[PDB]
């Protein structure tokens, strides 16, 4: 035994063979209880799955052989031995994840498997409580994964009862200093969705509006966090989440009645939500059109064009093509547009000058310009000259289509 | 009647060992970028020569 401890000091690299040999000695000496607790300690201490498999298998077969030998005959020992045998058979999944809880303790995916293996939700709460303390936010690898743990933990209460408990838990969640911001969206979007089904969307706005308290000097805070290298929490640039702005806007836009008007409170609030997104430069081309279509559906068409003009310069010319198409298609054909013909021509000439200055295929704008010029004044000669400008200015198939239309019209 | 329980336990344990050993042997997309992302992407991925121009270019290469 003393020599055993000496090699435990001297050779730590082959611990598996050491523990197996000492276990064999314990079995040979009749120290079955010693074998039991020694194997338990070693099994808890394993770290690599190949090592775990050998010790777990040896423990399982030792229990099997000892129980069968005692059965060959004592009652209490046999009862305890087959009880441990059945326990080790069943607890394989628990030991399986016990290995992964030591390979990387803060990898939250394993905690989301350990919860799944628990028998009852009364235990799922306990495992979530352990997981929250064991996990440290600074080392969570995959972004947006710890937030899923708080989201699931709150949902666990929310499914049964005690909505107050879920809310008070979640208020603790947002206080955790997360390194990444996907973890924060996963909590706010879930909390707002769960409140929407219960307390109405009036409350559901408040949950997201607390997250989007825009601070002064956004550039300074975004610089501090971006250049902080995980040192600064994502709590301070929460305003810079596109997914929270998108869901907040979805809730506002779905809450606006289809017959809303400028004096309605929700319609004004949606305007401020969109204008603040544009000011923050979080507007995406699909959202810049979503805003313009919201305004057009509410008969505020003349202010729809201000959206297009506020947003077109920000994007690269390749995307300016799509927004220019939308802008001109709405301007030329819509009963509420008050643009004079010289204004619509000014828009068209601006679009063609800017886009053709960057080589973007402008066939559709040229065709729309020719059609508009035929519509508004009836000057066919000017319409043809516009098409010829398109064909004469590398997109060879488009220039062949403009040559066929220009010539056929002439 | 512990014999039947032992038999069932051994049957389950064989499968547990087999599974453990098997685990042991392993030993339109562009319309959604924000303006900020466009600024980042657009900054990360944006005959004859006079002797004075060639000189400056050679200096820069050096």
């Amino acid at each position: 035994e003393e020599f055993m401890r000496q090699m435990n000091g001297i050779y730590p690299d082959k611990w598996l063979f050491l523990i197996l040999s000492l276990a064999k000695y314990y079995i040979s000496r009749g120290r079955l209880d010693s074998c039991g607790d020694l194997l338990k300690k070693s099994l808890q201490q394993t770290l690599r799955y190949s090592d775990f498999d050998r010790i777990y298998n040896f423990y399982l077969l030792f229990e099997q052989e000892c129980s069968q030998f005692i059965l060959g005959k004592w009652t209490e020992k046999l009862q305890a031995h087959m009880a441990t045998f059945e326990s080790l058979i069943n607890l394989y999944d628990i030991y399986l994840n016990d290995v992964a809880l030591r390979q990387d303790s803060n990898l939250v995916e394993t905690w989301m498997k350990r919860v799944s293996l628990q028998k009852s939700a009364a235990e799922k709460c306990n495992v979530y409580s352990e997981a929250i303390l064991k996990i440290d936010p600074r080392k969570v690898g995959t972004p947006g994964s710890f937030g899923r743990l708080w989201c699931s933990y709150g949902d666990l209460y929310w499914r049964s009862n005690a909505i107050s408990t879920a809310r008070e838990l979640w208020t603790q969640s947002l206080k955790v200093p997360y390194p990444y911001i996907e973890d924060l969206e996963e909590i706010y979007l879930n909390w707002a969705d769960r409140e929407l089904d219960k307390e109405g969307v009036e409350r559901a706005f408040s949950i997201l509006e607390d997250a989007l308290h825009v601070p002064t000097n956004p550039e300074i805070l975004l610089e501090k966090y971006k250049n902080g290298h995980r040192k600064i929490p994502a709590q301070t640039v929460l305003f810079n989440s596109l997914r929270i702005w998108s869901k907040y806007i979805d809730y506002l836009e779905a809450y606006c009645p289809k017959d809303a008007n400028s004096s309605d409170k929700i319609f004004n609030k949606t305007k401020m939500a969109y204008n603040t997104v544009i000011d923050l430069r979080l507007i995406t081309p699909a959202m810049a059109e979503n805003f313009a279509l919201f305004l057009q559906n509410h008969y505020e068409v003349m202010e729809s064009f201000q959206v297009y003009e506020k947003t077109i310069p920000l994007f690269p010319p390749e995307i300016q093509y799509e927004l220019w198409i939308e802008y001109l298609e709405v301007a030329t054909s819509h009963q509420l547009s008050s643009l004079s013909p010289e204004h619509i021509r000014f828009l068209f000439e601006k679009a063609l000058k800017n886009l053709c200055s960057n080589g973007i295929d402008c066939k559709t704008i040229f065709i729309a310009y020719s059609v508009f010029e035929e519509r508004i004044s009836g000057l066919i000669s000017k319409s043809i000259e516009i098409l010829r400008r398109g064909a004469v200015i590398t997109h060879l198939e488009s220039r062949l289509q403009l040559w066929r239309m220009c010539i056929s019209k002439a | 009647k512990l014999d039947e329980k032992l038999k069932e336990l051994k049957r389950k344990r064989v499968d547990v060992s087999i599974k453990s050993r098997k685990l042991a042997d392993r030993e339109e997309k562009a319309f959604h970028y924000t303006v900020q992302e466009y600024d980042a992407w657009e900054r990360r991925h944006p005959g004859g020569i006079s002797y004075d121009q060639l000189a400056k270019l050679s200096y820069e290469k050096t």
């Binding site: 699909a286 059109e289 799509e322 939308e326 | 339109e28």
Partner: peptide
């Protein structure tokens, strides 16, 4: 139309699913 208005019309149609939960 085909590029962005086509997507946005789908967005205004998906919001009917949110409107169901809005009223209920």
């Amino acid at each position: 139309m085909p590029s962005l208005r086509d997507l946005s019309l789908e967005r205004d149609q998906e919001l009917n699913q949110l409107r169901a939960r809005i009223n209920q």
